[PDB]
Amino acid sequence: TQPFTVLIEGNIGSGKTTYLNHFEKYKNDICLLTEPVEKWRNVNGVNLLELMYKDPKKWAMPFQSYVTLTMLQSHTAPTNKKLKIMERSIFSARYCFVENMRRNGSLEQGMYNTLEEWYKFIEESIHVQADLIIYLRTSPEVAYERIRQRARSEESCVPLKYLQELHELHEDWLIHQRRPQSCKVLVLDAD
Amino acid sequence: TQPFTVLIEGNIGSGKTTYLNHFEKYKNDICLLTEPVEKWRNVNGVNLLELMYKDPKKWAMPFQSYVTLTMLQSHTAPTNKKLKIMERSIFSARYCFVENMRRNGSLEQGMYNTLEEWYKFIEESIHVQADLIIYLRTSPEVAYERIRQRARSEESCVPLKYLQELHELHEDWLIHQRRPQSCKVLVLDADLNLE
Ligand SMILES: Nc1ccn([C@H]2C[C@H](O)[C@@H](CO)O2)c(=O)n1
Ligand SMILES: Nc1ccn([C@H]2C[C@H](O)[C@@H](CO)O2)c(=O)n1
Secondary structure, eight states: OOOEEEEEEOOTTSSHHHHHHHGGGGTTTSEEEOOOHHHHHOBTTBOHHHHHHHOHHHHHHHHHHHHHHHHHHHHHOOOSSSEEEEESOHHHIIIIIIHHHHHTTSSOHHHHHHHHHHHHHHHHSSOOOOSEEEEEEOOHHHHHHHHHHTTOSTTTTOOHHHHHHHHHHHHHHHTSSOOOTTOEEEEEEOO | OOOEEEEEEEOTTSOHHHHHHTTGGGTTTEEEEOOOHHHHTOBTTBOHHHHHHHOHHHHHHHHHHHHHHHHHHHHTOOOOSSEEEEESOHHHIIIIIHHHHHHTTOSOHHHHHHHHHHHHHHHHHSOOOOSEEEEEEOOHHHHHHHHHHHTOGGGTTOOHHHHHHHHHHHHIIIIITOOTTOOOEEEEETTSSOO
16 A cells, blocks of 8 residues: 655656755655666666667667566565655656657557556556656756756757747647546646 | 466477367367467468578577467467367477577577576566476487478478477476476377377
């Protein structure tokens, strides 16, 4: 079982990290799970994040596959705290990042299908705690800015086009669509 | 949630199907799960099995991942029979087929790694019922004949060396490197023409 869980969603460079760094001083009453980027950067030695951004058509599949795994581990990790805040989720991994990779051709149909089958099996079994989604809404330009200020080795080549597509997907999912009673969405202007 | 389970393992062309047919008649007391191969041939329209054999460096990883999923589905499927018989398992996929694709160079480090991490997680979360393993043991040459006469479209380009690698892998797993926390193992002579 999991306590009240909050999912911090948003584009790359939407200030999620900075934002949830605030909650750090309260780690004693709140379970804080940042994106397991360190895991993605070091999978038994390999940097999947790096490989994916360097050669999407080749590494998008294994990468998103691992991301699903680690997000799933985070969603199901037990805790004694009564509040849980996670940076991003399996929902955004599926509806935004994977879908985007399918559109730009990084994921070949059979690869997209495999990932979708996994998402279906998970939802059919492993229930995921999601009570609140705070959506740090931004504009691609501002997101591009943040990314540029912090020299992230892997994100050193993400085009503005890429951010726009991710942005649109986050919009289609969190705003231009009725949400279930099981989960509320709080939109904040990041910019 | 799972009853006594038997995993039927063997190389490609070891007569699993034929052998599993002898169990059709007991369908009332036995839950028989066949390899979800036809699912692999139809993943919402795409034939992952074909693609895997056609260009493993690109498709081995997605294919095996879907295999894991489908096998996992069988390992945890509903049943109301007091005996369960599965054709293959996540174990043969992990220790034989994935290992083979790693050795032959089809799976690059990160892909093999991703696959292995899923295995760790699957067994840390779920528990897979495995009480006995029946091993239809054959020689790679005999297995090659079966595959040849079977004439399966996707296996059309499977060379003897491939079956040779898989054979060694099954041997190491079910016989040599075997240990007393043993899932008990019954070794059958699948070179026999029909038992
Ligand atoms: N499903 C996901 C989740 C995150 N990321 C990437 C986007 C950023 O580069 C980094 C997070 O800041 O992780 C990704 O490619 N796919
Ligand atoms: N983990 C697995 C399981 C099966 N197969 C292949 C072997 C045969 O070609 C077909 C099963 O009869 O699927 C495979 O490549 N990998």
